[PDB]
């Protein structure tokens, strides 16, 4: 059996996964959903031909997107996840007792449906009382929020649909508006090997509105280049100033209080981008 | 043109590079040598179907294998590189003034020959007076050395051919014998996602003979999983105790005095292996 | 979406089909069954990683295996299909009014099951009163038959399991035994580009027992090289001597009374094999 | 070594050849030339990512394009090959003593150059005194010819560049003009599985100007579907009326006097196209 799913992460480079069978294939109003069972990583979800998560390595992205900003915040209580259909970031947010309510907003309800069905270990906490799942825009949702959230984790850094975010460089100012006075927001910002421009631009644009703008790193083997990047915009708390007593035992497979600080130590060529 | 070179890094997973043309293809006494021109990474050298280096990302491996142990050592003067045919580690070793002589030992002279020819930016320093290039075993060379080297960077951790290294768990004790009383040695020790057993075993076996045994990390996009691992066996100096004044300006694209320490902060699942 | 199924028809050459989703994947007592939906050919069935049929091109094999021997026979009434799980040859056999009963014998009932389910246009006639489907050996079945069939269409030319066919070069003499005095048998005998030896051997071995041994051709785009070969062993009727009045209107997409004769005109290099 | 060259003969289907090394890669004024050494077929030439010929199967195309029209003609003496850079059709034309002069016109001189160098068994006769090689347009050449040729074998059926062929449906009438009063022309016209429209259109357009318009077939394993098609436009001689005494011993590996007629017996679905 030679059934392989290939992702050309670049016109000239990519990864190829051996597939045992497809679990669900569907063209949505928004994208092409494909849950597949791979031999190497277990069930893997692809959106528009690109890898979203897999059972085997999903923990890196989910833990690093959630825990760095939550522990940076002295006491996160109201959190927003935009575009986290698979529910993985929500699963990690719930490990923080301080969180009163975690809202999840994703335009595609079919991502949530099939993740609950085929990625139970990732989407199994969406049914939790502390979670409020909403199938809606997300960018529209941020546009309509005013100092409601302590931490906001965002999927895409480029709004599509109602770009009511007409603030200068709209999006980031839109997020600042939705965040409380000492809010924090995180956005994945690709890899430094094939799309380094994105890191420079986002880093500069976010800095225009947040006094604290840092960039951290993590290894995701299923993502382009194996090195993923995250931009953290903070209004008041420095992620590198976290008090040791602030941490508490939490079950993770990647994140560590030390990794928390070490993820901000960038390889020379990556610092050069900012 | 759809000419692609695929490396099945696992029976069920791999990377695929678009190739413009092959530069040199030859079956050696030792291995299958293939220099190829890739569109994404420039010239790339493959040995027995596996990626060795490429012009675009070679700097990570070369810098992290060389600089971590050299700066850990208060004053490296006599260094040995076993298996560094492409000459990249030698190129980095020469950036340290303290180095009086750097010996390179590789069984395949054809790797050295074609790297000089197609990877000039990597092999261009092998003609330097401070370098002594020897086309010979390497394991036999270590077996026949007695406290001659300050730092020894090793390619493979498993000796083939004359396994005269009959010391208990031979190899490492063989290396301790070739090293000076305060010597340091480094050996790449694969990735933690597909061959985690190797990290556990090497880490344990090296610890049996060196008082200091640490494991550090680096991102190599062309290597399995994007996260590569390195084992450092030290007889006296701690890589995490390097004095700030010890560092000096050196031209690198990845390595940093901070990366030096941060590379030893392991993701939770990786620490679990040791 | 870059999900492709590749068949290395040779260690150095093959075809690659874009897949939309898998329909059924199962490891049987006998083989690895994989029904898949391809974008180019519709549903396609693979057995042990090799293409069996597809909705788009199945007609060539089914028509040429069935019609050449049936029309060569002045009046076929009792026909046997060994290994025709997908029911395609049976579908074609039923277009001949003279056929009183068509027996289908296949070891894997799961091939019949899933072909009925996903290849209805091919397996839809297996429920016909004139058909007798038996999930059993096939070679054992031929070994236990004595002048019962007018025409026998065989899948593999090499018996596995009880090789009770101990007649000199057993199989063909076993088939002659199962055939009536003026019986005819047909067996696909691969392509002349990558496995030409098989054509020489079979042609010679069949000739040892049947006075008439011819080889005919057909284009199957999903099979190795695009040119497939069929061996016809006849005890009395010459496929090239068919009377014009013998033919009658029959619905086909490939086979023609003229193709009937033209399929036996071999390219120079193919004649050289026999 | 897993270096493979894939040709997506359709967005959803293709063939993949294992490559040992590239021989020559060059971007020409006209196209992307790639001579490559494959393990399965020997040296293979690709133009714009599509297979042109290979040492192993080149004989089919070359023989069937040449010999069918030459033997159909009672006495071919002046022959034109448009776009036969590799020189294979020329090699076959020279097997006919009646041919006084064979003109070859190809826009890309580099195809001729590298075919002579890497495909000697195909291009080795272009240095023959009876051959007149011209690196020039081809369509311009046909536009400027007036009853000069007995047989004209054409590469593409769609003129590019100076479309001075303004005759009704220009091209074919342009060819009739270049042909002598009893001339014959042949043009490959793809396969019936993926581009059947082309066969219908060309067949109809050619019939508009030649009293005799037939379509013949041949198996080329390296071309889409394994079944290639050829359109023959004749002003007077019927390719199916060739006298037996007309043939003479000629060395070929595919073509045969019988194949000559059998190639015109089309599978039912192919007849349906015309």
From Swiss-Prot, chains A, B, C, D:
Its EC number is 2.5.1.16. Residues 2-235 form the PABS domain. One of its GO terms (biological process) is spermidine biosynthetic process. Spermidine binds at residues 62, 86, 155-158. S-methyl-5'-thioadenosine binds at residues 31, 106, 137-138, 162. It is an enzyme of class 2 (transferase). SUPFAM superfamilies: S-adenosyl-L-methionine-dependent methyltransferases. Keywords: Cytoplasm, Polyamine biosynthesis, Spermidine biosynthesis, Transferase. GO terms for cellular component: cytosol. GO terms for molecular function: spermidine synthase activity. Pathway: Amine and polyamine biosynthesis; spermidine biosynthesis; spermidine from putrescine: step 1/1. The active site is at residue 155. It holds the Pfam family Spermine_synt_N. It catalyses: S-adenosyl 3-(methylsulfanyl)propylamine + putrescine = S-methyl-5'-thioadenosine + spermidine + H(+). It is found in: Cytoplasm. Involved in the cell growth and proliferation. Catalyzes the irreversible transfer of a propylamine group from the amino donor S-adenosylmethioninamine (decarboxy-AdoMet) to putrescine (1,4-diaminobutane) to yield spermidine. HAMAP family: Spermidine_synth. Belongs to the spermidine/spermine synthase family. PANTHER family: SPERMIDINE SYNTHASE (PTHR11558:SF11), SPERMIDINE/SPERMINE SYNTHASE (PTHR11558). Homodimer or homotetramer. B.subtilis has only one biosynthetic pathway from agmatine to spermidine to produce polyamines. This is Polyamine aminopropyltransferase. The lineage of its organism: Bacteria, Bacillati, Bacillota, Bacilli, Bacillales.
């Amino acid at each position: 059996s030679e059934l392989w799913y290939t992702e050309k992460q670049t016109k000239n480079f990519g990864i190829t996964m051996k597939v045992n069978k497809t679990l669900h294939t569907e063209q949505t109003e928004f994208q092409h959903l494909e849950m597949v069972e791979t031999e190497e990583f277990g069930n893997m979800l692809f959106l528009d031909g690109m890898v979203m998560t897999s059972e085997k390595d999903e923990f890196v992205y989910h833990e690093m997107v959630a825990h760095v900003p939550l522990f940076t915040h002295p006491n996160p209580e109201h959190v927003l996840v935009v575009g986290g259909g698979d529910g993985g970031v929500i699963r990690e947010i719930l490990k923080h007792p301080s969180v009163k309510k975690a809202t999840l907003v994703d335009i595609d309800g079919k991502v949530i449906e099939y993740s609950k069905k085929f990625l139970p270990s990732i989407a199994g906490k969406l049914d939790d009382p502390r979670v409020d799942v909403q199938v809606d825009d997300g960018f529209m949702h941020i546009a309509k929020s005013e100092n409601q959230y302590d931490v906001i984790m965002v999927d895409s850094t480029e709004p599509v649909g109602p770009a009511v975010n007409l603030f200068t460089k709209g999006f980031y100012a839109g997020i600042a508006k939705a965040l409380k006075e000492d809010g924090i927001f995180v956005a994945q910002t690709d890899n430094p090997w094939f799309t380094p421009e994105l890191i420079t631009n986002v880093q500069r644009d976010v800095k225009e509105i947040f006094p604290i703008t840092k960039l951290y790193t993590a290894n995701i083997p299923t993502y382009p280049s194996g090195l993923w990047t995250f931009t953290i915009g903070s209004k008041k708390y420095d992620p590198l100033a976290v008090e040791d007593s602030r941490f508490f035992d939490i079950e993770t497979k990647y994140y560590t209080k030390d990794i928390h600080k070490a993820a901000f130590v960038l390889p020379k060529f990556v610092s050069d981008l900012i």
